[PDB]
């Protein structure tokens, strides 16, 4: 997630892992999905759990 | 529910003296006292409104006072042609205008005009339809109220129809609910009154007057202390018809 | 000024077009009204709001306004379609500008009566009245369109349906006084200091809208006309 002037630039990528210890070694890129054209000065974020 | 009674009954004071008219009230009412003078046969005329300001046209010898649950009128001058009955009316209750038994005083012992029509016998064909046509003020910006006057009993409340601005609802009294229906004809500037289900006690003299001004814009800069407020936003009495009943 | 060809031609059986362009201040911001006046009679409205037509005019006439120009299409012209067509537009400068007239030459109740004529006295005074009865005069507005002999239509003045704000032309501003009488149902027009170039009939036009064309820029239109009085202003 970024804070561009007009777009939010949400990048995502889903890759299967097998080590299950930490962030595995390997180069994977994130393809863009949605670029929200909303202008807002965001300086704080927080995840959500169910 | 507020009963207004006058203390004097028969004031036979000679001219060139003072005169007092006491009026009490059960409920604590604010300064909403209106004085009237009705010559025998003619239409009533308001003298003092709100018990603080006098009308425009009557002499200055009508300075009154009093506030709260008691009112009085101090006529400290002579009575040249004051032979009339002085009634009272409270201006607090808008749909419940109630009068009182006025005192009968004796000596010893204007482009706004509206007329009425319709009268006569009522026992055959108990269905009347009177009229109230005005040729003065612009009909439509004021509400029309009706008042009846029984012989030797005084004025009495009938009903009123609100102006076109403040809703087209109605509100009658307790003794005329479901019997008298009032409708307006602002397109023709004529006020009617249906008198279905007529009885022997409903043989009073009906009068149609004005009500509050629906356009309160002019009532802002104008103070309720001059002739303009009495000319624009005030009730005007007119003529009255006769109802005859038999067996 | 509305650019319009002076005269067109057409054969019976084919569809012709009559264009009337103008500036973006009168056509691009308002509606164009087409009229047709047979030789020796009063005009009549044909297409109003650029997409509607009255019940009197059949659906054989077509009209459209693209941008700052209009077009009058007459599908299947007959032998009786020989007259002059004028366009109408209300500019934002409070003026009613007409077109030039298209002399189409083929190759094959509501009553508005007006009086007042005779000696014009160019330099004195003249009274012109227009009667009105049978179309709810208190709701519809009025107009004044003059037509010189051999010339096109020319707007004079306009009065609102409420009798309030009024407007005059740029060449007759300050000299005329238009008024109406809602009680007598009559239209008056006080003309003062008439010049020698005011030789026309002063047709009494009836509007279909209520307010002036400046606020109602999508409903104004002269439906019913009348038989004007030919003036005799001379030396």
């Amino acid at each position: 997630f970024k804070n561009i002037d007009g777009y939010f630039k949400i990048y995502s990528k889903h890759t299967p892992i097998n080590l299950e210890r930490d962030l595995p070694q390997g180069f994977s890129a994130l393809e863009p999905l949605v670029d929200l054209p909303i202008g807002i000065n965001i300086t704080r974020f927080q995840t959500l759990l169910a | 529910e507020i009963v207004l009674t006058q203390s004097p009954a028969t004031l036979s004071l000679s001219p060139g003296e003072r005169a007092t008219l006491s009026c009490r009230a059960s409920q604590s009412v604010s300064s909403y006292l209106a004085w009237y003078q009705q010559k025998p046969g003619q239409a009533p005329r308001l003298l003092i409104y709100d018990a603080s300001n006098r009308a425009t046209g009557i002499p200055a010898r009508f300075s009154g006072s009093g506030s709260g649950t008691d009112f009085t009128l101090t006529i400290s001058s002579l009575e040249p042609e004051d032979f009339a009955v002085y009634y009272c009316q409270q201006r607090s209750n808008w749909p419940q205008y109630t009068f009182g038994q006025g005192t009968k005083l004796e000596i010893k012992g204007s482009e706004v005009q509206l007329v009425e029509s319709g009268g006569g016998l009522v026992k055959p064909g108990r269905s009347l339809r009177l009229s109230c046509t005005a040729s003065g003020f612009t009909f439509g910006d004021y509400a029309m109220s009706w008042f009846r006057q029984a012989p030797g009993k005084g004025l009495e409340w009938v009903g009123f129809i609100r102006s076109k601005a403040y809703g087209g609802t109605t509100e009658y009294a307790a003794s005329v609910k479901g019997r008298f229906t009032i409708s307006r004809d602002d397109s023709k500037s004529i006020a009617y009154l249906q008198m279905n289900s007529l009885k022997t006690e409903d043989t009073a003299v009906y009068y149609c007057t004005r009500d509050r001004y629906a356009r309160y814009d002019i009532l802002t800069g104008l103070s309720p202390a001059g002739a303009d407020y009495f000319y624009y936003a005030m009730d005007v009495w007119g003529q009255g018809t006769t109802v005859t009943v038999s067996s | 000024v509305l650019t319009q060809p002076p005269s067109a031609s057409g054969t019976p059986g084919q569809r012709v077009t009559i264009s009337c362009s103008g500036s973006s201040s009168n056509i691009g911001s308002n509606t164009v009204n087409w009229y047709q006046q047979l030789p020796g009679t009063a005009p009549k409205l044909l297409i109003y709001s650029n997409n509607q037509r009255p019940s009197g005019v059949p659906d054989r006439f077509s009209g459209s306004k693209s941008g700052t120009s209009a077009s009058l299409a007459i599908s299947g012209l007959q032998s009786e379609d020989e007259a002059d067509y004028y366009c109408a537009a209300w500019d934002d400068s409070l003026n009613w500008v007409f077109g030039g007239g298209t002399k189409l030459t083929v190759l094959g109740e509501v009553q508005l009566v007006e009086s007042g004529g005779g000696v014009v006295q160019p330099g004195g005074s003249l009274r012109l009245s227009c009667a009105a009865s049978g179309f709810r005069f208190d709701d519809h507005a009025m107009h004044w369109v003059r037509q010189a002999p051999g010339k096109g239509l020319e707007w004079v003045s306009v009065i609102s349906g409420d009798g309030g704000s009024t407007y005059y032309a740029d060449s007759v501003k300050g000299r005329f006084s238009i008024s109406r009488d809602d009680s007598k149902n009559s239209l008056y027009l006080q003309m003062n200091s008439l010049r020698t170039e005011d030789t026309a009939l002063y047709y009494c036009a009836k509007d279909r809208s209520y307010g002036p064309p400046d606020v109602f820029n999508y409903e104004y239109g002269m439906d019913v006309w009348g038989q004007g009085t030919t003036v005799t202003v001379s030396s």
Partner: protein
């Protein structure tokens, strides 16, 4: 105060529904634009695009 619209009243006292459209140019990117037109994709030829 109420209007009291009646069909017997003449032209002038009738209900007129007014829809006023406003336009603003804020700092946020334009989320509403016009209907950009389209054309026919021609084959191999030196033209504009």
């Amino acid at each position: 105060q109420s209007y009291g619209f009646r069909p017997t009243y003449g032209v002038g006292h009738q209900p007129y529904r007014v829809v006023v459209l406003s336009f603003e140019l804020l700092h946020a990117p334009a989320t509403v634009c016009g209907p950009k037109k389209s054309t026919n994709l021609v084959k191999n030829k030196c033209v504009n695009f």
